[PDB]
Amino acid sequence: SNKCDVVVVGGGISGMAAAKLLHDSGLNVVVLEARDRVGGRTYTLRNQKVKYVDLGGSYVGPTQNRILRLAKELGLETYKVNEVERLIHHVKGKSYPFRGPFPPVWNPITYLDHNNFWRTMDDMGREIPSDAPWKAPLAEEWDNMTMKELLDKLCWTESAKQLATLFVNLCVTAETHEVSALWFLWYVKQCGGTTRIISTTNGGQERKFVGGSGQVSERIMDLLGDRVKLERPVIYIDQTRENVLVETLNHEMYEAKYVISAIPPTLGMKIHFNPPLPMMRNQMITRVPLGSVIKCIVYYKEPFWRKKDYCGTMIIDGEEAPVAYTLDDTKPEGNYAAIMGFILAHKARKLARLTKEERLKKLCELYAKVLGSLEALEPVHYEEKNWCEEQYSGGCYTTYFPPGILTQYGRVLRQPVDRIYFAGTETATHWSGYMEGAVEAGERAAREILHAMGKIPEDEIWQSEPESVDVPAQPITTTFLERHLPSVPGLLRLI
Amino acid sequence: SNKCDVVVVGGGISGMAAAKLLHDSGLNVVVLEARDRVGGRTYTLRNQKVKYVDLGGSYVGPTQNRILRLAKELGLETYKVNEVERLIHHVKGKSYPFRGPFPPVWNPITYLDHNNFWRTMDDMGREIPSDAPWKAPLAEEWDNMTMKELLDKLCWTESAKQLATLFVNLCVTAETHEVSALWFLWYVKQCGGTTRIISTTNGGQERKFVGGSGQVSERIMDLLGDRVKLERPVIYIDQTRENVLVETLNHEMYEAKYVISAIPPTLGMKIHFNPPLPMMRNQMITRVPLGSVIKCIVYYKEPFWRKKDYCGTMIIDGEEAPVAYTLDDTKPEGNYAAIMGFILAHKARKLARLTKEERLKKLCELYAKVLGSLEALEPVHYEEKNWCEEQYSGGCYTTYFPPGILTQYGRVLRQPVDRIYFAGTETATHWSGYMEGAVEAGERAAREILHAMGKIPEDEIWQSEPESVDVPAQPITTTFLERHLPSVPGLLRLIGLTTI
Numbered sequence: 001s002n003k004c005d006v007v008v009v010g011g012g013i014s015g016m017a018a019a020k021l022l023h024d025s026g027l028n029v030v031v032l033e034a035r036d037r038v039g040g041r042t043y044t045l046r047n048q049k050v051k052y053v054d055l056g057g058s059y060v061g062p063t064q065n066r067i068l069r070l071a072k073e074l075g076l077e078t079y080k081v082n083e084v085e086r087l088i089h090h091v092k093g094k095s096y097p098f099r100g101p102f103p104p105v106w107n108p109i110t111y112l113d114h115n116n117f118w119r120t121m122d123d124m125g126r127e128i129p130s131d132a133p134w135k136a137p138l139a140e141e142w143d144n145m146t147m148k149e150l151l152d153k154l155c156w157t158e159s160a161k162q163l164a165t166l167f168v169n170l171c172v173t174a175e176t177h178e179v180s181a182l183w184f185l186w187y188v189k190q191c192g193g194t195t196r197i198i199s200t201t202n203g204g205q206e207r208k209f210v211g212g213s214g215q216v217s218e219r220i221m222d223l224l225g226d227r228v229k230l231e232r233p234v235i236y237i238d239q240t241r242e243n244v245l246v247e248t249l250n251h252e253m254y255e256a257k258y259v260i261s262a263i264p265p266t267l268g269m270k271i272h273f274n275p276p277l278p279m280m281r282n283q284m285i286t287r288v289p290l291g292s293v294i295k296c297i298v299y300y301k302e303p304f305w306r307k308k309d310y311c312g313t314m315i316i317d318g319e320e321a322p323v324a325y326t327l328d329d330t331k332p333e334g335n336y337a338a339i340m341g342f343i344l345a346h347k348a349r350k351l352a353r354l355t356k357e358e359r360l361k362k363l364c365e366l367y368a369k370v371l372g373s374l375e376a377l378e379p380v381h382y383e384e385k386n387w388c389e390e391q392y393s394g395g396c397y398t399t400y401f402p403p404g405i406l407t408q409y410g411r412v413l414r415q416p417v418d419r420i421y422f423a424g425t426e427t428a429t430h431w432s433g434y435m436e437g438a439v440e441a442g443e444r445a446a447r448e449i450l451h452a453m454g455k456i457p458e459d460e461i462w463q464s465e466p467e468s469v470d471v472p473a474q475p476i477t478t479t480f481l482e483r484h485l486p487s488v489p490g491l492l493r494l495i
Numbered sequence: 496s497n498k499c500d501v502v503v504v505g506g507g508i509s510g511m512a513a514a515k516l517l518h519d520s521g522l523n524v525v526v527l528e529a530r531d532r533v534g535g536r537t538y539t540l541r542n543q544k545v546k547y548v549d550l551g552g553s554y555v556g557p558t559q560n561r562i563l564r565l566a567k568e569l570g571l572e573t574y575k576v577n578e579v580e581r582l583i584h585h586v587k588g589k590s591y592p593f594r595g596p597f598p599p600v601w602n603p604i605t606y607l608d609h610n611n612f613w614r615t616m617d618d619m620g621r622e623i624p625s626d627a628p629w630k631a632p633l634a635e636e637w638d639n640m641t642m643k644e645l646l647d648k649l650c651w652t653e654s655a656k657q658l659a660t661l662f663v664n665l666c667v668t669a670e671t672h673e674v675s676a677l678w679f680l681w682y683v684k685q686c687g688g689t690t691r692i693i694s695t696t697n698g699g700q701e702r703k704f705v706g707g708s709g710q711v712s713e714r715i716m717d718l719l720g721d722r723v724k725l726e727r728p729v730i731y732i733d734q735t736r737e738n739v740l741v742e743t744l745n746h747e748m749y750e751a752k753y754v755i756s757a758i759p760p761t762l763g764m765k766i767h768f769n770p771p772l773p774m775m776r777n778q779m780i781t782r783v784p785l786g787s788v789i790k791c792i793v794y795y796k797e798p799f800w801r802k803k804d805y806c807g808t809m810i811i812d813g814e815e816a817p818v819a820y821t822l823d824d825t826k827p828e829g830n831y832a833a834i835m836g837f838i839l840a841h842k843a844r845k846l847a848r849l850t851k852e853e854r855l856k857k858l859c860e861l862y863a864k865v866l867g868s869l870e871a872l873e874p875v876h877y878e879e880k881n882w883c884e885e886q887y888s889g890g891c892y893t894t895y896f897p898p899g900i901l902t903q904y905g906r907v908l909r910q911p912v913d914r915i916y917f918a919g920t921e922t923a924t925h926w927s928g929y930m931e932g933a934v935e936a937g938e939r940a941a942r943e944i945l946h947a948m949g950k951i952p953e954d955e956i957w958q959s960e961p962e963s964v965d966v967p968a969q970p971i972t973t974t975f976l977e978r979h980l981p982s983v984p985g986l987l988r989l990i991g992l993t994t995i
């Protein structure tokens with residue numbers, strides 16, 4: 001058997017971050033990665049036509065200080081997602097160009113409804129502990145409702161409901177009826193709230209890595225060399241003995257003092273445990289699916305939308321549109337002009353049955369309508385990735401919690417099981433579901449093990465992160481009117 | 496590599512029924528069973544104190560003809576669960592003895608609400624195809640709501656809502672808020688409806704197997720001999736070559752023309768697939784958890800409840816009661832007096848913290864109050880099984896579908912993946928979640944492979960089952976009043992129109 005201090009299961013960002021921290025501490029780490037590549041839910045494809053493209057996780061932003069610090073240490077640079085020109089909200093078959101993070105509404109009733117919806121999500125969020133959403137004072141009430149129910153309750157307008165729906169679909173690549181209100185509200189609040197999560201400028205979509213996010217995992221793999229074992233899917237973990245035994249599908253045996261599980265919680269199901277997992281984890285890892293998304297990048301000779309003062313961001317309401325949300329994916333040099341769009345939630349399932357060429361045509365025709373340009377009909381290249389297909393991801397971006405699960409099982413997610421500690425973005429308390437959360441969880445799990453080894457004190461397991469100098473956070477602000485305008489039922493009570 | 500025609504993954508009733516059918520058709524079958532035993536979610540414990548006790552699936556009933564036929568063929572007999580004396584509905588700290596399948600109410604408004612709740616469950620069920628619940632006209636609308644939301648819409652009394660909630664908890668060992676309304680309405684409909692599923696006499700809980708339901712799998716294992724491989728958890732299935740390769744955790748390799756997956760759908764995750772599963776299945780097997788239950792059996796010197804004219808059936812409403820439902824589990828001979836109780840859904844999680852001795856005390860104190868009997872405080876023995884703990888079950892009784900899942904993923908539950916066919920009770924179209932469904936699905940998967948091999952025509956894949964002559968099904972009947980009494984909103988609509 002191959003003997004080491006710690007086996008890290010999964011060479012995604014979380015696993016790689018944990019392995020790098022343990023390696024840097026002088027421990028012998030081995031990273032066992034199921035795939036023939038590192039990066040997991042990050043994947044950067046290189047070819048002459050795109051140079052490079054992120055087909056998985058890509059965007060980083062302010063307050064994601066851990067992924068920015070790790071990336072900078074590995075010699076990576078960020079550039080800003082193009083948000084110079086106008087965003088588009090495409091509503092009832094018409095493009096409404098706008099500026100700012102939130103699509104505007106003109107109907108005064110609809111305005112109150114929209115304002116109240118975003119405000120209420122953050123108000124509810126403020127009662128949900130980041131590290132313990134199940135401790136929210138109304139945790140049971142909110143966990144026992146879907147986002148669909150909450151939105152049906154809150155939204156007096158079809159307009160607000162459709163945008164809130166799009167927002168849920170885009171945040172968590174799931175339907176409003178699929179997810180716990182408590183979990184969703186937690187999810188938003190632990191990314192710093194509605195503005196932070198939805199924003200390009202000053203939000204989660206501000207930046208991308210020059211040369212692609214896959215370089216974070218690739219360059220930690222560069223550092224660790226042969227400590228990374230590719231095509232080593234872990235099938236079995238045995239903690240009955242002095243040392244933990246980790247077995248891979250190619251029959252290899254790894255012996256460690258401790259294990260970090262840096263895989264999506266539900267992919268814990270692909271590992272056979274001895275002894276059995278405790279009851280609550282045994283059931284938890286069956287209750288926590290990942291969302292559904294196809295990431296699609298259409299390439300053009302030029303970023304022709306910029307000529308019409310569109311930045312390439314499109315928010316596209318309604319069932320018919322295959323893509324509800326797009327960003328400009330042009331390279332910082334202004335070449336390899338491209339529009340990135342997500343086919344979200346049920347549409348990922350619906351449109352997966354088409355050919356690549358058919359999806360390209362649907363995307364091109366949608367983009368020609370929304371951008372109002374025939375140039376959208378003349379793609380020079382197309383790249384796409386359906387994350388629903390991935391045995392070793394389960395989906396993207398992340399794990400959602402259906403109604404009732406977070407309150408009953410949420411405490412389990414990072415509870416050590418003897419000498420197995422849990423990393424993975426799902427176990428983060430901030431930007432859980434992001435590359436940031438991956439780094440937070442990997443490093444926290446690694447330091448749980450350093451604490452178990454008597455190498456660090458309890459108070460050093462959870463470590464704050466200095467703010468990035470390259471990507472500083474600007475405060476999230478609201479207006480007096482946004483804070484105090486009445487809800488639609490608020491305005492009715494008054495009449 | 497160990498070569499055969501069909502590898503069956505899982506030695507529950509479904510995989511055993513599949514293996515038996517294929518074996519009986521002249522094929523070379525292997526059953527790869529993860530545990531040191533067969534039976535899966537069925538498990539008959541034997542010791543001197545209890546003689547035998549089903550800690551898992553136990554009850555069979557009218558319309559469950561496939562399990563009755565399979566059991567009978569294996570030499571098993573059934574007996575009737577005790578329903579001679581009064582059932583108890585325990586609501587708000589008081590016991591109300593009654594007779595008949597549904598706890599009665601006297602309050603006329605409450606009467607219309609209860610009547611309408613049960614009627615509406617079945618009315619909605621009649622819209623849902625057993626084999627394609629996603630084809631219900633309102634499939635999307637019903638699949639996008641929880642049972643909590645549907646009860647909130649339907650129940651105009653707290654009384655009906657509390658009984659309805661208990662009904663859901665008891666039926667699918669899940670909270671009303673955890674489960675799809677479409678799926679739950681399908682689930683009840685595919686068991687023959689509210690009366691059939693809830694009833695002891697003339698329903699799902701009418702009978703038990705003499706000696707325990709574990710005998711079904713054990714006796715099929717005896718028939719198959721060494722073809723059943725215990726402690727062979729499957730870890731890897733490879734379909735990239737001419738023959739399917741199935742690898743187990745101990746590194747044994749099996750080579751087959753075809754595979755039957757007879758494991759709960761989500762436990763499909765414990766297998767690494769080459770090539771990868773198609774997208775829809777890849778995601779479906781992460782979206783379908785099993786419910787949560789502790790089955791608890793408290794033993795007494797005598798079935799002392801019978802002397803107070805109580806059959807041992809207690810429907811116990813509300814949060815404090817660890818157990819919401821009990822049946823007399825006394826042996827047919829009248830000895831090893833016992834009360835079987837379920838600790839359901841969240842209470843299974845909540846009370847698993849306690850010691851066995853502490854759960855026993857809580858159950859006795861409950862039974863003492865519900866039965867008005869100090870004798871309930873004098874148990875002689877106790878057995879329990881928390882199914883939440885089982886790596887190779889995931890829970891009990893069965894897989895539930897959270898909102899949105901059944902319409903998006905439902906269609907691939909039993910869709911073959913190249914040379915893998917899917918059995919297990921979850922893939923049944925009648926009494927899915929039950930031993931009956933396990934038999935239906937195992938046999939159907941087996942016949943799919945027989946069809947793929949050109950051994951039978953397509954029209955023999957799905958086979959009807961002759962009605963058991965031993966457990967005849969009384970039809971489910973409604974009275975004129977039951978069909979036409981207005982809902983509470985129907986009564987209110989009538990009152991509106993009279994005053995006009």
Ligand SMILES: *Cc1cc2c(cc1C)nc1c(=O)[nH]c(=O)nc-1n2C[C@H](O)[C@H](O)[C@H](O)COP(=O)(O)OP(=O)(O)OC[C@H]1O[C@@H](n2cnc3c(N)ncnc32)[C@H](O)[C@@H]1O
Nearest residue numbers: 010012013014034040041057058059234396425433434435
């Ligand atoms: C897919 C996706 C993700 C994504 C997103 C868009 C798409 C289409 N956009 C994002 C974004 O713009 N910014 C961001 O921060 N995140 C975005 N996401 C999410 C992001 O990619 C993930 O949160 C992050 O990559 C998660 O990292 P983590 O390290 O937690 O998880 P992982 O990448 O899934 O890595 C797990 C690795 O484990 C291997 N694996 C799985 N099972 C096994 C077994 N049994 N044995 C060994 N290895 C295993 C996986 O192969 C993977 O490499």
Ligand SMILES: *Cc1cc2c(cc1C)nc1c(=O)[nH]c(=O)nc-1n2C[C@H](O)[C@H](O)[C@H](O)COP(=O)(O)OP(=O)(O)OC[C@H]1O[C@@H](n2cnc3c(N)ncnc32)[C@H](O)[C@@H]1O
Nearest residue numbers: 505507508509529535536552553554729891919920928930
């Ligand atoms: C647990 C339970 C179930 C139950 C119930 C009460 C409880 C507490 N009450 C019931 C009742 O009164 N009447 C009834 O008809 N059903 C009742 N249920 C449900 C019933 O037990 C189940 O529907 C039924 O037994 C399911 O049979 P099925 O054959 O579909 O599935 P299974 O029993 O889970 O068997 C699966 C087998 O597969 C093995 N396994 C799992 N993973 C693997 C891998 N990777 N490799 C190989 N084998 C695997 C399991 O060990 C199991 O044996």
Ligand SMILES: c1ccc2c(c1)[IH]c1ccccc1-2
Nearest residue numbers: 059170171197198199205327
């Ligand atoms: C709200 C709004 C937009 C996004 C998100 C949440 I996760 C993300 C990743 C890439 C593009 C866009 C998003």
Ligand SMILES: c1ccc2c(c1)[IH]c1ccccc1-2
Nearest residue numbers: 554665666692693694700820
């Ligand atoms: C409704 C009512 C009662 C039951 C069921 C559904 I699954 C069954 C198995 C054992 C006891 C009770 C039940």
